[PDB]
């Protein structure tokens, strides 16, 4: 039901004009990585503001499940990204593009979406000794009247999450000003 999200984004992500809803897009992805840390699976989260104005969030948790979901006939990861915290499916719906990478059970999986529509089924692209999830997303300029992330707004929330989740190392990178901050209680 991502149609409803695109039609009334304010109801799902908050104010699309004043910067709050825009930064909520990053916070929703980070909150999924924090849940992975609370469960004891993740101890490092890297949040990057890219030169292209996109944001990536990488965790070293379990990685989103990749096995086919019986009811849906597609990867569990696709079901989580494409069917309605508000959930990462809201971030996907309101992103012109989203790139998902999963490191799980010795394999690297990827899927790309445009406005929440998968471009191809989740595919294995290589081998890895690591586990975790990376989401890179480009917020839709059709939804958000401002799409430029403020490193100070992200920094304040990441500092809070670092404090509240001691033992998670949170790295904030802003490629636009070559900034890196490490939050580790
Ligand atoms: C940056 C980032 N990281 C994650 C992330 O790691 N999420 C993971 N979710 C699971 C998991 O629950 C799935 C089936 C589920 C997700 C939402 C609601 C209900 C169910 C199950 C398992 C498992 O059984 O191994 C592992 C994971 S890891 C997300 Cl989402 C985002 Cl965004």
């Amino acid at each position: 039901g991502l149609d409803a999200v695109r039609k009334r984004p304010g109801m799902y992500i908050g104010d699309t004009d004043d910067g709050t809803g825009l930064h909520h897009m990053v916070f929703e992805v980070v909150d999924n990585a924090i849940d992975e840390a609370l469960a004891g699976h993740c101890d490092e989260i890297i949040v990057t503001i890219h030169e292209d104005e996109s944001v990536s969030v990488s965790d070293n948790g379990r990685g989103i499940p990749t096995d086919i979901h019986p009811e849906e006939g597609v990867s569990a990861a696709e079901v989580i990204l494409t069917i309605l915290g508000v959930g990462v499916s809201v971030v996907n719906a309101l992103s012109s593009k989203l790139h998902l990478t999963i490191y799980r059970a010795g394999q690297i999986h990827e899927q790309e979406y445009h406005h929440g529509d998968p471009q191809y089924p989740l595919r294995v692209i290589g081998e890895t000794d690591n586990t975790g999830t990376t989401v890179r997303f480009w917020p839709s300029a059709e939804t958000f009247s401002q799409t430029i992330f403020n490193v100070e707004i992200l920094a304040r929330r990441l500092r809070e999450l670092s404090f509240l989740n001691a033992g998670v190392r949170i790295v904030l990178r802003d490629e636009r000003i070559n900034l890196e901050h490490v939050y580790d209680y």
Side-chain angles (χ1 to χ4, degrees), residues 41-70 72-79:
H41 304 303
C42 164
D43 71 2
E44 191 170 76
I45 303 172
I46 306 183
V47 182
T48 304
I49 310 175
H50 297 269
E51 187 59 56
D52 70 1
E53 304 293 354
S54 69
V55 164
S56 68
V57 175
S58 296
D59 70 47
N60 66 348
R62 289 171 292 172
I64 303 173
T66 63
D67 282 357
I68 299 308
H69 200 271
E72 312 295 339
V74 296
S75 72
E78 174 169 336
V79 175

PDB file of all heavy atoms in Angstrom, residues 41-79, unseen atoms left out:
ATOM      1  N   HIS A  41      23.111  -7.914  17.894  1.00  0.00           N
ATOM      2  CA  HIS A  41      23.644  -8.412  16.592  1.00  0.00           C
ATOM      3  C   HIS A  41      24.573  -7.385  15.931  1.00  0.00           C
ATOM      4  O   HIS A  41      25.427  -7.800  15.134  1.00  0.00           O
ATOM      5  CB  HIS A  41      22.493  -8.770  15.653  1.00  0.00           C
ATOM      6  CG  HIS A  41      21.540  -9.750  16.235  1.00  0.00           C
ATOM      7  ND1 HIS A  41      21.947 -10.991  16.690  1.00  0.00           N
ATOM      8  CD2 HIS A  41      20.208  -9.686  16.423  1.00  0.00           C
ATOM      9  CE1 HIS A  41      20.900 -11.657  17.128  1.00  0.00           C
ATOM     10  NE2 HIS A  41      19.818 -10.881  16.972  1.00  0.00           N
ATOM     11  N   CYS A  42      24.406  -6.107  16.251  1.00  0.00           N
ATOM     12  CA  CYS A  42      25.090  -4.965  15.592  1.00  0.00           C
ATOM     13  C   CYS A  42      25.827  -4.125  16.643  1.00  0.00           C
ATOM     14  O   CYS A  42      25.221  -3.826  17.705  1.00  0.00           O
ATOM     15  CB  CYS A  42      24.061  -4.128  14.849  1.00  0.00           C
ATOM     16  SG  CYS A  42      24.661  -2.482  14.408  1.00  0.00           S
ATOM     17  N   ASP A  43      27.099  -3.795  16.387  1.00  0.00           N
ATOM     18  CA  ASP A  43      27.908  -2.918  17.272  1.00  0.00           C
ATOM     19  C   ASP A  43      28.538  -1.769  16.476  1.00  0.00           C
ATOM     20  O   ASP A  43      29.290  -0.983  17.088  1.00  0.00           O
ATOM     21  CB  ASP A  43      28.946  -3.719  18.056  1.00  0.00           C
ATOM     22  CG  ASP A  43      30.113  -4.279  17.266  1.00  0.00           C
ATOM     23  OD1 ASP A  43      30.191  -4.037  16.040  1.00  0.00           O
ATOM     24  OD2 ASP A  43      30.966  -4.923  17.908  1.00  0.00           O
ATOM     25  N   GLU A  44      28.237  -1.640  15.179  1.00  0.00           N
ATOM     26  CA  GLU A  44      28.769  -0.521  14.364  1.00  0.00           C
ATOM     27  C   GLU A  44      27.716  -0.085  13.346  1.00  0.00           C
ATOM     28  O   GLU A  44      27.164  -0.949  12.664  1.00  0.00           O
ATOM     29  CB  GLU A  44      30.087  -0.890  13.686  1.00  0.00           C
ATOM     30  CG  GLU A  44      30.765   0.324  13.066  1.00  0.00           C
ATOM     31  CD  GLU A  44      32.180   0.084  12.582  1.00  0.00           C
ATOM     32  OE1 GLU A  44      32.326  -0.538  11.524  1.00  0.00           O
ATOM     33  OE2 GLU A  44      33.119   0.508  13.274  1.00  0.00           O
ATOM     34  N   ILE A  45      27.445   1.218  13.298  1.00  0.00           N
ATOM     35  CA  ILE A  45      26.521   1.853  12.318  1.00  0.00           C
ATOM     36  C   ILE A  45      27.282   3.011  11.674  1.00  0.00           C
ATOM     37  O   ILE A  45      27.823   3.841  12.411  1.00  0.00           O
ATOM     38  CB  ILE A  45      25.203   2.305  12.977  1.00  0.00           C
ATOM     39  CG1 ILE A  45      24.494   1.139  13.672  1.00  0.00           C
ATOM     40  CG2 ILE A  45      24.287   2.965  11.961  1.00  0.00           C
ATOM     41  CD1 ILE A  45      23.283   1.541  14.493  1.00  0.00           C
ATOM     42  N   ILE A  46      27.352   3.030  10.346  1.00  0.00           N
ATOM     43  CA  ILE A  46      28.022   4.125   9.588  1.00  0.00           C
ATOM     44  C   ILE A  46      26.939   4.846   8.781  1.00  0.00           C
ATOM     45  O   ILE A  46      26.237   4.211   7.982  1.00  0.00           O
ATOM     46  CB  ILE A  46      29.188   3.599   8.722  1.00  0.00           C
ATOM     47  CG1 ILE A  46      30.181   2.801   9.571  1.00  0.00           C
ATOM     48  CG2 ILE A  46      29.869   4.747   7.988  1.00  0.00           C
ATOM     49  CD1 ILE A  46      31.393   2.311   8.835  1.00  0.00           C
ATOM     50  N   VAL A  47      26.799   6.139   9.024  1.00  0.00           N
ATOM     51  CA  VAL A  47      25.808   7.020   8.362  1.00  0.00           C
ATOM     52  C   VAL A  47      26.617   8.006   7.527  1.00  0.00           C
ATOM     53  O   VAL A  47      27.488   8.684   8.090  1.00  0.00           O
ATOM     54  CB  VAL A  47      24.917   7.749   9.376  1.00  0.00           C
ATOM     55  CG1 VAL A  47      23.886   8.606   8.667  1.00  0.00           C
ATOM     56  CG2 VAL A  47      24.254   6.772  10.340  1.00  0.00           C
ATOM     57  N   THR A  48      26.404   8.006   6.216  1.00  0.00           N
ATOM     58  CA  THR A  48      27.168   8.872   5.287  1.00  0.00           C
ATOM     59  C   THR A  48      26.198   9.786   4.537  1.00  0.00           C
ATOM     60  O   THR A  48      25.211   9.276   3.994  1.00  0.00           O
ATOM     61  CB  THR A  48      28.009   8.039   4.317  1.00  0.00           C
ATOM     62  OG1 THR A  48      28.859   7.171   5.064  1.00  0.00           O
ATOM     63  CG2 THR A  48      28.854   8.902   3.404  1.00  0.00           C
ATOM     64  N   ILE A  49      26.489  11.088   4.532  1.00  0.00           N
ATOM     65  CA  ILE A  49      25.905  12.069   3.580  1.00  0.00           C
ATOM     66  C   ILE A  49      26.878  12.127   2.396  1.00  0.00           C
ATOM     67  O   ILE A  49      28.036  12.563   2.576  1.00  0.00           O
ATOM     68  CB  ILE A  49      25.688  13.457   4.212  1.00  0.00           C
ATOM     69  CG1 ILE A  49      24.942  13.396   5.553  1.00  0.00           C
ATOM     70  CG2 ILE A  49      24.981  14.365   3.212  1.00  0.00           C
ATOM     71  CD1 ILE A  49      24.815  14.739   6.244  1.00  0.00           C
ATOM     72  N   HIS A  50      26.444  11.607   1.253  1.00  0.00           N
ATOM     73  CA  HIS A  50      27.272  11.491   0.030  1.00  0.00           C
ATOM     74  C   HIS A  50      27.333  12.852  -0.661  1.00  0.00           C
ATOM     75  O   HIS A  50      26.428  13.699  -0.448  1.00  0.00           O
ATOM     76  CB  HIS A  50      26.737  10.372  -0.866  1.00  0.00           C
ATOM     77  CG  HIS A  50      26.812   9.023  -0.238  1.00  0.00           C
ATOM     78  ND1 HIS A  50      27.898   8.191  -0.395  1.00  0.00           N
ATOM     79  CD2 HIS A  50      25.957   8.379   0.586  1.00  0.00           C
ATOM     80  CE1 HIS A  50      27.709   7.080   0.301  1.00  0.00           C
ATOM     81  NE2 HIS A  50      26.518   7.170   0.897  1.00  0.00           N
ATOM     82  N   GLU A  51      28.363  13.043  -1.477  1.00  0.00           N
ATOM     83  CA  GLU A  51      28.533  14.262  -2.306  1.00  0.00           C
ATOM     84  C   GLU A  51      27.261  14.502  -3.132  1.00  0.00           C
ATOM     85  O   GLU A  51      26.893  15.669  -3.316  1.00  0.00           O
ATOM     86  CB  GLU A  51      29.777  14.112  -3.178  1.00  0.00           C
ATOM     87  CG  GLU A  51      30.120  15.387  -3.922  1.00  0.00           C
ATOM     88  CD  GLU A  51      30.366  16.585  -3.025  1.00  0.00           C
ATOM     89  OE1 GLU A  51      31.235  16.452  -2.158  1.00  0.00           O
ATOM     90  OE2 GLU A  51      29.686  17.633  -3.191  1.00  0.00           O
ATOM     91  N   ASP A  52      26.611  13.438  -3.614  1.00  0.00           N
ATOM     92  CA  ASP A  52      25.380  13.516  -4.443  1.00  0.00           C
ATOM     93  C   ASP A  52      24.137  13.839  -3.603  1.00  0.00           C
ATOM     94  O   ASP A  52      23.070  13.871  -4.181  1.00  0.00           O
ATOM     95  CB  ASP A  52      25.185  12.239  -5.273  1.00  0.00           C
ATOM     96  CG  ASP A  52      24.815  10.987  -4.494  1.00  0.00           C
ATOM     97  OD1 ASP A  52      24.673  11.075  -3.258  1.00  0.00           O
ATOM     98  OD2 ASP A  52      24.726   9.921  -5.110  1.00  0.00           O
ATOM     99  N   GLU A  53      24.285  14.056  -2.288  1.00  0.00           N
ATOM    100  CA  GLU A  53      23.218  14.476  -1.341  1.00  0.00           C
ATOM    101  C   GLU A  53      22.409  13.271  -0.851  1.00  0.00           C
ATOM    102  O   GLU A  53      21.525  13.494   0.001  1.00  0.00           O
ATOM    103  CB  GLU A  53      22.272  15.523  -1.931  1.00  0.00           C
ATOM    104  CG  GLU A  53      22.970  16.766  -2.447  1.00  0.00           C
ATOM    105  CD  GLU A  53      23.649  17.660  -1.424  1.00  0.00           C
ATOM    106  OE1 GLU A  53      23.509  17.410  -0.191  1.00  0.00           O
ATOM    107  OE2 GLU A  53      24.331  18.601  -1.874  1.00  0.00           O
ATOM    108  N   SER A  54      22.691  12.053  -1.327  1.00  0.00           N
ATOM    109  CA  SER A  54      22.063  10.807  -0.810  1.00  0.00           C
ATOM    110  C   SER A  54      22.631  10.507   0.582  1.00  0.00           C
ATOM    111  O   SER A  54      23.692  11.065   0.964  1.00  0.00           O
ATOM    112  CB  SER A  54      22.236   9.630  -1.768  1.00  0.00           C
ATOM    113  OG  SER A  54      23.593   9.201  -1.827  1.00  0.00           O
ATOM    114  N   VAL A  55      21.942   9.636   1.314  1.00  0.00           N
ATOM    115  CA  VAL A  55      22.426   9.135   2.630  1.00  0.00           C
ATOM    116  C   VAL A  55      22.508   7.622   2.548  1.00  0.00           C
ATOM    117  O   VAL A  55      21.561   7.008   2.010  1.00  0.00           O
ATOM    118  CB  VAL A  55      21.529   9.595   3.790  1.00  0.00           C
ATOM    119  CG1 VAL A  55      21.781   8.792   5.064  1.00  0.00           C
ATOM    120  CG2 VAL A  55      21.723  11.068   4.052  1.00  0.00           C
ATOM    121  N   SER A  56      23.605   7.063   3.051  1.00  0.00           N
ATOM    122  CA  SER A  56      23.714   5.603   3.273  1.00  0.00           C
ATOM    123  C   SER A  56      23.781   5.340   4.783  1.00  0.00           C
ATOM    124  O   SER A  56      24.351   6.143   5.511  1.00  0.00           O
ATOM    125  CB  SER A  56      24.847   4.988   2.476  1.00  0.00           C
ATOM    126  OG  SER A  56      26.112   5.414   2.938  1.00  0.00           O
ATOM    127  N   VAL A  57      23.135   4.265   5.213  1.00  0.00           N
ATOM    128  CA  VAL A  57      23.235   3.707   6.588  1.00  0.00           C
ATOM    129  C   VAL A  57      23.683   2.256   6.418  1.00  0.00           C
ATOM    130  O   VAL A  57      22.964   1.498   5.756  1.00  0.00           O
ATOM    131  CB  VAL A  57      21.885   3.810   7.307  1.00  0.00           C
ATOM    132  CG1 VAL A  57      21.939   3.133   8.673  1.00  0.00           C
ATOM    133  CG2 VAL A  57      21.401   5.254   7.414  1.00  0.00           C
ATOM    134  N   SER A  58      24.839   1.905   6.978  1.00  0.00           N
ATOM    135  CA  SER A  58      25.398   0.529   7.012  1.00  0.00           C
ATOM    136  C   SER A  58      25.440   0.037   8.458  1.00  0.00           C
ATOM    137  O   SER A  58      25.957   0.773   9.295  1.00  0.00           O
ATOM    138  CB  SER A  58      26.768   0.496   6.390  1.00  0.00           C
ATOM    139  OG  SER A  58      26.689   0.831   5.012  1.00  0.00           O
ATOM    140  N   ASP A  59      24.927  -1.164   8.718  1.00  0.00           N
ATOM    141  CA  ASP A  59      25.079  -1.847  10.028  1.00  0.00           C
ATOM    142  C   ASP A  59      25.825  -3.161   9.793  1.00  0.00           C
ATOM    143  O   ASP A  59      25.967  -3.575   8.607  1.00  0.00           O
ATOM    144  CB  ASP A  59      23.730  -2.021  10.743  1.00  0.00           C
ATOM    145  CG  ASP A  59      22.790  -3.028  10.113  1.00  0.00           C
ATOM    146  OD1 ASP A  59      23.246  -4.132   9.804  1.00  0.00           O
ATOM    147  OD2 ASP A  59      21.599  -2.694   9.965  1.00  0.00           O
ATOM    148  N   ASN A  60      26.301  -3.768  10.881  1.00  0.00           N
ATOM    149  CA  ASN A  60      26.996  -5.079  10.888  1.00  0.00           C
ATOM    150  C   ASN A  60      26.135  -6.086  11.662  1.00  0.00           C
ATOM    151  O   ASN A  60      26.702  -7.005  12.282  1.00  0.00           O
ATOM    152  CB  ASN A  60      28.425  -4.947  11.411  1.00  0.00           C
ATOM    153  CG  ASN A  60      28.499  -4.555  12.871  1.00  0.00           C
ATOM    154  OD1 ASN A  60      27.498  -4.162  13.482  1.00  0.00           O
ATOM    155  ND2 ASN A  60      29.693  -4.642  13.421  1.00  0.00           N
ATOM    156  N   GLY A  61      24.812  -5.930  11.580  1.00  0.00           N
ATOM    157  CA  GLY A  61      23.813  -6.865  12.128  1.00  0.00           C
ATOM    158  C   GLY A  61      23.673  -8.122  11.288  1.00  0.00           C
ATOM    159  O   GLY A  61      24.623  -8.464  10.553  1.00  0.00           O
ATOM    160  N   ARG A  62      22.528  -8.792  11.403  1.00  0.00           N
ATOM    161  CA  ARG A  62      22.271 -10.133  10.814  1.00  0.00           C
ATOM    162  C   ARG A  62      22.164 -10.027   9.289  1.00  0.00           C
ATOM    163  O   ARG A  62      22.341 -11.072   8.622  1.00  0.00           O
ATOM    164  CB  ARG A  62      20.981 -10.723  11.385  1.00  0.00           C
ATOM    165  CG  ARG A  62      21.102 -11.137  12.848  1.00  0.00           C
ATOM    166  CD  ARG A  62      19.760 -11.526  13.453  1.00  0.00           C
ATOM    167  NE  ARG A  62      18.898 -10.358  13.558  1.00  0.00           N
ATOM    168  CZ  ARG A  62      17.615 -10.361  13.905  1.00  0.00           C
ATOM    169  NH1 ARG A  62      16.992 -11.488  14.196  1.00  0.00           N
ATOM    170  NH2 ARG A  62      16.952  -9.220  13.951  1.00  0.00           N
ATOM    171  N   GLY A  63      21.827  -8.839   8.768  1.00  0.00           N
ATOM    172  CA  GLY A  63      21.393  -8.676   7.367  1.00  0.00           C
ATOM    173  C   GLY A  63      19.931  -9.055   7.236  1.00  0.00           C
ATOM    174  O   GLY A  63      19.522 -10.081   7.850  1.00  0.00           O
ATOM    175  N   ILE A  64      19.141  -8.271   6.498  1.00  0.00           N
ATOM    176  CA  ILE A  64      17.698  -8.579   6.266  1.00  0.00           C
ATOM    177  C   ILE A  64      17.608  -9.956   5.605  1.00  0.00           C
ATOM    178  O   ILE A  64      18.415 -10.271   4.732  1.00  0.00           O
ATOM    179  CB  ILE A  64      17.005  -7.505   5.416  1.00  0.00           C
ATOM    180  CG1 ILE A  64      17.130  -6.113   6.039  1.00  0.00           C
ATOM    181  CG2 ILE A  64      15.557  -7.895   5.143  1.00  0.00           C
ATOM    182  CD1 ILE A  64      16.611  -5.010   5.158  1.00  0.00           C
ATOM    183  N   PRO A  65      16.684 -10.842   6.052  1.00  0.00           N
ATOM    184  CA  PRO A  65      16.506 -12.143   5.409  1.00  0.00           C
ATOM    185  C   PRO A  65      16.285 -12.039   3.889  1.00  0.00           C
ATOM    186  O   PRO A  65      15.604 -11.122   3.442  1.00  0.00           O
ATOM    187  CB  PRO A  65      15.278 -12.694   6.143  1.00  0.00           C
ATOM    188  CG  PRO A  65      15.439 -12.129   7.537  1.00  0.00           C
ATOM    189  CD  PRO A  65      15.869 -10.701   7.276  1.00  0.00           C
ATOM    190  N   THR A  66      16.843 -12.998   3.147  1.00  0.00           N
ATOM    191  CA  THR A  66      16.902 -13.007   1.660  1.00  0.00           C
ATOM    192  C   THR A  66      16.030 -14.129   1.085  1.00  0.00           C
ATOM    193  O   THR A  66      15.639 -14.036  -0.092  1.00  0.00           O
ATOM    194  CB  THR A  66      18.365 -13.118   1.230  1.00  0.00           C
ATOM    195  OG1 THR A  66      18.862 -14.374   1.696  1.00  0.00           O
ATOM    196  CG2 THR A  66      19.200 -11.975   1.766  1.00  0.00           C
ATOM    197  N   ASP A  67      15.714 -15.144   1.887  1.00  0.00           N
ATOM    198  CA  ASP A  67      14.914 -16.326   1.471  1.00  0.00           C
ATOM    199  C   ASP A  67      13.538 -15.861   0.978  1.00  0.00           C
ATOM    200  O   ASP A  67      13.025 -14.836   1.458  1.00  0.00           O
ATOM    201  CB  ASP A  67      14.818 -17.348   2.610  1.00  0.00           C
ATOM    202  CG  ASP A  67      16.074 -18.197   2.802  1.00  0.00           C
ATOM    203  OD1 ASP A  67      17.032 -18.048   2.007  1.00  0.00           O
ATOM    204  OD2 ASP A  67      16.092 -19.011   3.745  1.00  0.00           O
ATOM    205  N   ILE A  68      12.961 -16.573   0.010  1.00  0.00           N
ATOM    206  CA  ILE A  68      11.632 -16.213  -0.555  1.00  0.00           C
ATOM    207  C   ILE A  68      10.592 -16.264   0.567  1.00  0.00           C
ATOM    208  O   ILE A  68      10.592 -17.237   1.346  1.00  0.00           O
ATOM    209  CB  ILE A  68      11.256 -17.140  -1.720  1.00  0.00           C
ATOM    210  CG1 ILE A  68      12.259 -17.041  -2.875  1.00  0.00           C
ATOM    211  CG2 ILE A  68       9.835 -16.856  -2.173  1.00  0.00           C
ATOM    212  CD1 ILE A  68      12.514 -15.632  -3.356  1.00  0.00           C
ATOM    213  N   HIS A  69       9.737 -15.247   0.624  1.00  0.00           N
ATOM    214  CA  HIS A  69       8.544 -15.187   1.507  1.00  0.00           C
ATOM    215  C   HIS A  69       7.415 -15.956   0.827  1.00  0.00           C
ATOM    216  O   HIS A  69       6.944 -15.541  -0.234  1.00  0.00           O
ATOM    217  CB  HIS A  69       8.149 -13.735   1.805  1.00  0.00           C
ATOM    218  CG  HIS A  69       7.295 -13.629   3.018  1.00  0.00           C
ATOM    219  ND1 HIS A  69       5.926 -13.728   2.972  1.00  0.00           N
ATOM    220  CD2 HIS A  69       7.618 -13.518   4.314  1.00  0.00           C
ATOM    221  CE1 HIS A  69       5.429 -13.644   4.188  1.00  0.00           C
ATOM    222  NE2 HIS A  69       6.445 -13.517   5.024  1.00  0.00           N
ATOM    223  N   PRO A  70       6.972 -17.107   1.387  1.00  0.00           N
ATOM    224  CA  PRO A  70       5.949 -17.934   0.750  1.00  0.00           C
ATOM    225  C   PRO A  70       4.706 -17.174   0.265  1.00  0.00           C
ATOM    226  O   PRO A  70       4.267 -17.422  -0.848  1.00  0.00           O
ATOM    227  CB  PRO A  70       5.549 -18.913   1.864  1.00  0.00           C
ATOM    228  CG  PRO A  70       6.804 -19.055   2.695  1.00  0.00           C
ATOM    229  CD  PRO A  70       7.455 -17.693   2.647  1.00  0.00           C
ATOM    230  N   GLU A  71       4.164 -16.273   1.091  1.00  0.00           N
ATOM    231  CA  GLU A  71       2.868 -15.596   0.803  1.00  0.00           C
ATOM    232  C   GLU A  71       3.046 -14.681  -0.417  1.00  0.00           C
ATOM    233  O   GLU A  71       2.084 -14.515  -1.171  1.00  0.00           O
ATOM    234  CB  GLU A  71       2.358 -14.836   2.033  1.00  0.00           C
ATOM    235  N   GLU A  72       4.247 -14.138  -0.622  1.00  0.00           N
ATOM    236  CA  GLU A  72       4.501 -13.007  -1.558  1.00  0.00           C
ATOM    237  C   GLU A  72       5.264 -13.475  -2.802  1.00  0.00           C
ATOM    238  O   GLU A  72       5.179 -12.788  -3.819  1.00  0.00           O
ATOM    239  CB  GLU A  72       5.295 -11.919  -0.840  1.00  0.00           C
ATOM    240  CG  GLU A  72       4.724 -11.571   0.517  1.00  0.00           C
ATOM    241  CD  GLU A  72       3.345 -10.952   0.437  1.00  0.00           C
ATOM    242  OE1 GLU A  72       3.000 -10.437  -0.648  1.00  0.00           O
ATOM    243  OE2 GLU A  72       2.627 -10.977   1.451  1.00  0.00           O
ATOM    244  N   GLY A  73       6.006 -14.577  -2.711  1.00  0.00           N
ATOM    245  CA  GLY A  73       6.727 -15.154  -3.863  1.00  0.00           C
ATOM    246  C   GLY A  73       7.950 -14.344  -4.245  1.00  0.00           C
ATOM    247  O   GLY A  73       8.484 -14.600  -5.302  1.00  0.00           O
ATOM    248  N   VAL A  74       8.410 -13.435  -3.379  1.00  0.00           N
ATOM    249  CA  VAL A  74       9.646 -12.627  -3.560  1.00  0.00           C
ATOM    250  C   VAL A  74      10.442 -12.680  -2.259  1.00  0.00           C
ATOM    251  O   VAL A  74       9.865 -13.102  -1.229  1.00  0.00           O
ATOM    252  CB  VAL A  74       9.320 -11.182  -3.986  1.00  0.00           C
ATOM    253  CG1 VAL A  74       8.640 -11.168  -5.352  1.00  0.00           C
ATOM    254  CG2 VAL A  74       8.484 -10.439  -2.943  1.00  0.00           C
ATOM    255  N   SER A  75      11.721 -12.314  -2.322  1.00  0.00           N
ATOM    256  CA  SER A  75      12.648 -12.240  -1.166  1.00  0.00           C
ATOM    257  C   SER A  75      11.944 -11.546   0.015  1.00  0.00           C
ATOM    258  O   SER A  75      11.152 -10.588  -0.211  1.00  0.00           O
ATOM    259  CB  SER A  75      13.931 -11.528  -1.551  1.00  0.00           C
ATOM    260  OG  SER A  75      13.716 -10.128  -1.729  1.00  0.00           O
ATOM    261  N   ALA A  76      12.193 -12.016   1.235  1.00  0.00           N
ATOM    262  CA  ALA A  76      11.687 -11.358   2.466  1.00  0.00           C
ATOM    263  C   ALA A  76      12.120  -9.890   2.427  1.00  0.00           C
ATOM    264  O   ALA A  76      11.276  -9.020   2.713  1.00  0.00           O
ATOM    265  CB  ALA A  76      12.185 -12.068   3.702  1.00  0.00           C
ATOM    266  N   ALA A  77      13.370  -9.624   2.042  1.00  0.00           N
ATOM    267  CA  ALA A  77      13.926  -8.255   1.932  1.00  0.00           C
ATOM    268  C   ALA A  77      13.015  -7.387   1.057  1.00  0.00           C
ATOM    269  O   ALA A  77      12.688  -6.259   1.478  1.00  0.00           O
ATOM    270  CB  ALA A  77      15.336  -8.295   1.413  1.00  0.00           C
ATOM    271  N   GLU A  78      12.616  -7.864  -0.124  1.00  0.00           N
ATOM    272  CA  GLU A  78      11.690  -7.092  -0.996  1.00  0.00           C
ATOM    273  C   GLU A  78      10.357  -6.841  -0.268  1.00  0.00           C
ATOM    274  O   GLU A  78       9.824  -5.729  -0.343  1.00  0.00           O
ATOM    275  CB  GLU A  78      11.468  -7.798  -2.338  1.00  0.00           C
ATOM    276  CG  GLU A  78      10.418  -7.103  -3.190  1.00  0.00           C
ATOM    277  CD  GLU A  78      10.351  -7.590  -4.628  1.00  0.00           C
ATOM    278  OE1 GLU A  78      11.371  -8.119  -5.122  1.00  0.00           O
ATOM    279  OE2 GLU A  78       9.284  -7.449  -5.227  1.00  0.00           O
ATOM    280  N   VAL A  79       9.828  -7.833   0.427  1.00  0.00           N
ATOM    281  CA  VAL A  79       8.520  -7.674   1.116  1.00  0.00           C
ATOM    282  C   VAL A  79       8.647  -6.543   2.142  1.00  0.00           C
ATOM    283  O   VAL A  79       7.745  -5.695   2.213  1.00  0.00           O
ATOM    284  CB  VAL A  79       8.059  -8.992   1.753  1.00  0.00           C
ATOM    285  CG1 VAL A  79       6.787  -8.785   2.562  1.00  0.00           C
ATOM    286  CG2 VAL A  79       7.859 -10.057   0.686  1.00  0.00           C
TER     287      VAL A  79
END
